[PDB]
């Protein structure tokens, strides 16, 4: 198991600025045509997202490269995935991703999505396969290379599949999905929405709010996650690997303050990221997207102190040696208090 | 079984119950506390072992099979199971052990059936002299009475570990009455007001709405997914209009900005005014009521719309 062959790549990631992406409903409250200010975890506007490459697109005779390895995830990340075809069943959320620790499992299984929060023994390369078995005349979806042992069964989940096909126009949309993985107070939340992509690889400047899907009462301390993939084998369509290709993006969340517009029917039409530039701070204090001419006081700024010092006087002394460097000690009935 | 809704009140009128033995939880208030996890174990015990099998007991059985934490938060069920473990011939398959070294710890699975000696010589794996067996079989006989009969016992023991709690029961329910001043409880939202039928649009993941300054306005009914408005029950000051205590003792009362239907009777732009009769004349103002309407006393108290000159 766990076919281990990369041995060639150490390329640095591509860095881009996500124009206006990563806006959510940090509540379940309807709001009329209102402007609201929230202080929760958000992606800063125009941040350097590490553009990772999925299974590569290098067509000579098959031979698609796999250069999307293990990743760290501090507090919250985005998974903006094009995925013209199904390539990711889920992710490897967890703490250490080995035995004795519960690996948070999300798998497509697109009849009923299962979440199995139990101890597992995943290896570096869990992968898929969908082909015949000479019986039942179909392309069954065995997932045996994903996990070896399912131990200490504790949690279950059965519901509709997250991902679906909605293009209907010979592609050219890719049905972009973006996801958020927050775990605070042990509650795991996911946000998603279907969006089209007109560029070949890059992200547009459109604005879209991503509604919540699931609240999970898991309750596990979080250190690091990992990404999953799907490499079904190959057959006489020119060993057997390298099927599928897409493009991925991974960012990082930060505690930021947002001013979110609301339509007459709850859709967040626009938002502004405070603490980027003076103009954004001016809007955030006034709570307005249109600011008239004038001079406005936004905030204070102090000169933070540099390295601290402490000063104390001289004459840091008595001869304690005269107590211990005595040549001989006295009898145990003549204890001395050399004050 | 976890992350669902539990019920205990129905368990009072389900079968023939014998003795209510509860530790750490009042039996009349079983629907208050939230625990982390549920370990549902329901099995069969002996008759006199409702007391003879219990936490903190010595002798043969309770010391060495399992130990449960003496800090229970729950109840111990006791039924009569003379038709379960007593069969003619004997259900001697199970094991009432005699003695072991020491006790256990709560919520441990220590099941080993090792043979315990009485002396010190080693049997070398062969049963014989001085190799006394601490295992003894269950003794069940239909002829034997309470001293050996079985009793259905379900122990619902809950841990006091430090973890989030998820499993509790709800506080349902009542019906709905609209367009009336009532105090409502909607999914943990406690308030009072007038419930009516709305025409707004919630997104299909929200519970309740608010316009500005945390003033909740609409709450979706979680039975029919209908959006219900919230309007606060009407109020307002009460004013007493008097022509002087020596002129007369007759007064008229004004309710500040309150509709008449929610209290002669007359409706002004400044509230509802009772006790004063509206006239079509227009005189110089005497007692200003508001919004261009004044009142005076000329053998009854009457209301105008003041004239400028």
């Amino acid at each position, epitope marked *: 198991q766990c076919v281990n062959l990369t041995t060639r790549t150490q390329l640095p990631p591509a860095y881009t600025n996500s124009f206006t992406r990563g806006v959510y409903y940090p509540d379940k409250v309807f709001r009329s045509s209102v402007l609201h200010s929230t202080q929760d975890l958000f992606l800063p506007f125009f941040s350097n997202v590490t553009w990772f490459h999925a299974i590569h697109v290098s067509g000579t005779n098959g031979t698609k490269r796999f250069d999307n390895p293990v990743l760290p995830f501090n507090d919250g990340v985005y998974f903006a995935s094009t995925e013209k075809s199904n390539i990711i069943r889920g992710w490897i959320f967890g703490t250490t991703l080995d035995s004795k620790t519960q690996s948070l499992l999300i798998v497509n299984n697109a009849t009923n999505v299962v979440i199995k929060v139990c101890e597992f*023994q995943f290896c570096n390369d869990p992968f898929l396969g969908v082909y015949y078995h000479k019986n039942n005349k179909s392309w069954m979806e065995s997932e045996f290379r994903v996990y070896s*042992s*399912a131990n200490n069964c504790t949690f279950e989940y059965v519901s509709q599949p997250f991902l679906m096909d909605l293009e209907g126009k010979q592609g050219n949309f890719k049905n972009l999905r973006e996801f958020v993985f927050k775990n605070i107070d042990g509650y795991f939340k996911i946000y998603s929405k279907h969006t089209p992509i007109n560029l070949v690889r890059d992200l547009p400047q459109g604005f879209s709010a991503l509604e919540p899907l699931v609240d999970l009462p898991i309750g596990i301390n979080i250190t690091r996650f990992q990404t999953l993939l799907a490499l079904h084998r190959s057959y006489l369509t020119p060993s057997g690997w390298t099927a599928g290709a897409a493009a991925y993006y991974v960012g990082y969340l930060q505690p930021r303050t947002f001013l979110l517009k609301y339509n007459e029917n709850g859709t967040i039409t626009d938002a502004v990221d405070c603490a980027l530039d003076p103009l954004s701070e001016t809007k955030c204090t006034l709570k307005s997207f249109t600011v008239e001419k004038g001079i406005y006081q936004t905030s204070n700024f102090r000169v933070q102190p540099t390295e601290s010092i402490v000063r104390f006087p001289n004459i840091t002394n008595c001869p304690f040696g005269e107590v211990f460097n005595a040549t001989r000690f006295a009898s145990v009935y003549a204890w001395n208090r050399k004050r | 079984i976890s992350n669902c809704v539990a019920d205990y009140s129905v368990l009072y009128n389900s079968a023939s119950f014998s003795t209510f033995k509860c530790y750490g939880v009042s039996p009349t208030k079983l629907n208050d506390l939230c625990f982390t996890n549920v370990y549902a174990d329901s099995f069969v015990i002996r008759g006199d072992e409702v007391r003879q099998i219990a936490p903190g007991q010595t002798g043969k059985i309770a010391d060495y099979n399992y130990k449960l934490p003496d800090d229970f938060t729950g109840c111990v069920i006791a039924w009569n199971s003379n038709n379960l473990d007593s069969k003619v011939g004997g259900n001697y398959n199970y094991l009432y052990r005699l003695f072991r070294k020491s006790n256990l710890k709560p919520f441990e*699975r220590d*099941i080993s059936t090792e043979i315990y000696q009485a002396g010190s010589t080693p049997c070398n794996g062969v049963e014989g002299f001085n190799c006394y067996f601490p295992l003894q079989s269950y003794g069940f006989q239909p002829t034997n009475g309470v001293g050996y009969q079985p009793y259905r016992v379900v122990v619902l023991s809950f841990e006091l570990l430090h973890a989030p709690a998820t499993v509790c029961g709800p506080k349902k329910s009542t019906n709905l009455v609209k367009n009336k001043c009532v105090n409502f409880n909607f999914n943990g939202l406690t308030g009072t007001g007038v419930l009516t039928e709305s025409n707004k649009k919630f997104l299909p993941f929200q519970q309740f709405g608010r316009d500005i300054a945390d003033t909740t306005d609409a709450v979706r009914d979680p039975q029919t997914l209908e959006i219900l408005d919230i309007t606060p029950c009407s109020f307002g000051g009460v004013s007493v209009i008097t022509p002087g205590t020596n002129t007369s003792n007759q007064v008229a009362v004004l309710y500040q900005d309150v509709n008449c239907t929610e209290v002669n009777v007359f409706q002004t732009r400044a509230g509802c005014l009772i006790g004063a009769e509206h006239v079509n004349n227009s005189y110089e103002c005497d007692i200003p009521i508001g919004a261009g309407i004044c009142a005076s006393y000329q053998q009854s108290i009457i209301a105008y719309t003041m004239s400028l000159g």
Partner: nanobody
Amino acid sequence: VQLVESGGGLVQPGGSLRLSCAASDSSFYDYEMSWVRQAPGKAQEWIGSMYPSGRTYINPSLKSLVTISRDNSKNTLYLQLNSLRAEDTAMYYCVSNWASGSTGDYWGQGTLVTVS
């Protein structure tokens, strides 16, 4: 809990039953598992044993009653038994490294298979 025993129960004389023992990993199989019982008076004779690489050897004189199979998806164990008799009057155990004594192993739950 490394090893958990699945299935089993009281057996009527002249009946049959199937056992199970979910395994934590294929690595703990090294190099002899155990479908151990406590027969009355009869010595401790191993019945079910197997190897991490997927081998199987059974005692020649006691293999007319016991069959073994596995699946690697759930790491569940199959002990399909036929014609149960009175020589099983105890509760079983499926414990790894049983042959190395009774102190270098983890004890799970076990199952009872007895007849009159």
